[PDB]
Amino acid sequence: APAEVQAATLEKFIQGWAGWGFLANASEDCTQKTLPFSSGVPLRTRADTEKLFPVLMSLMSNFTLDIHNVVHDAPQGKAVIYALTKADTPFGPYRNEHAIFLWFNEIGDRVQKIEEMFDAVVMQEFLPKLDKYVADNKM
Amino acid sequence: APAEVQAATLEKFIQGWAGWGFLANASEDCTQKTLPFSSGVPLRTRADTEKLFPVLMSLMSNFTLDIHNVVHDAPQGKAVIYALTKADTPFGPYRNEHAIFLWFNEIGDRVQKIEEMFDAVVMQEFLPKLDKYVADNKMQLGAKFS
């Protein structure tokens, strides 16, 4: 895939994340992996992502994305982003950082695969709160 | 820097890491940052790294590196490695995973800056054991693991 069509996909993925979109630029068979592998989280399908994202958006306001580093390997059709996010939530201020590994599809115009390492120390505080929120409200 | 020069430095960095000989591929002014920024770890100078690394090596036997993903952006002089590691230590078995961001120098023959996120949950047990180790043995490195 041409470096410039990949770069377009990369830019639209970032703009979609900052807009709070994300999934317009992902192919239909895209998967998301939570790193590290030791965390033992199964891949998320596209269908999974479309259910989780409304819950997140519904809980996070003033969502802000700060891009720290973008590394693009056009010959391999791969990229990495390091980003920092913040938002307001009913559980308090939310802060996270992401090293997101991206693979583009054959043509270069879609994200085919995602692997993402989060701020694990923040997540072990935040993520069970979300699961509690869903259980208490029975979704 | 030419892509070929950068790629050579990259493979040498990996080889020297897996060989557990490693600082030879780092510039004299190289820094290492532990990510996330939220963890509040000050940057490590090359001198810090030269004191910490022998200590690490000496507590880590049968070290094993598995390269999961290499991403090389030659136009920007940058690369990223996702890797998993294994070792035996007197504190028990060691397991870690690393998203390591690299910047090459101008010529391309050296790594100039390192930013590294790792298995933060597993390491908040392990790295304080190392710092207690150094304290208990009065090794006074002027540097900490966490």
From Swiss-Prot, chain A:
Family statement drawn from the similarity comment of this UniProt entry: Belongs to the avfA family.
Function of the protein: Monooxygenase; part of the gene cluster that mediates the biosynthesis of the tetrahydroxanthone dimer neosartorin, which exhibits antibacterial activity. The two different monomeric units appear to be synthesized by the same set of enzymes, among which the Baeyer-Villiger monooxygenase nsrF is the key enzyme for the divergence of the biosynthetic routes. The pathway begins with the synthesis of atrochrysone thioester by the polyketide synthase nsrB. The atrochrysone carboxyl ACP thioesterase nsrC then breaks the thioester bond and releases the atrochrysone carboxylic acid from AacuL.
Organism listed in the record: Aspergillus novofumigatus (strain IBT 16806)
Keyword Oxidoreductase part of the UniProt annotation: yes
Protein name (Swiss-Prot/TrEMBL): Monooxygenase nsrQ
Keywords, sorted A to Z: Monooxygenase, Oxidoreductase
Family matches, as InterPro entries: Fungal_Meroterpenoid_Isomerase, NTF2-like_dom_sf
Pathway: Secondary metabolite biosynthesis
EC number(s) from the headed UniProt entry: 1.-.-.-
Keyword Oxidoreductase: yes
SUPFAM superfamilies reported for this sequence: NTF2-like
Top EC class, one word: oxidoreductase
Domain of life of the source: Eukaryota
GO MF: monooxygenase activity
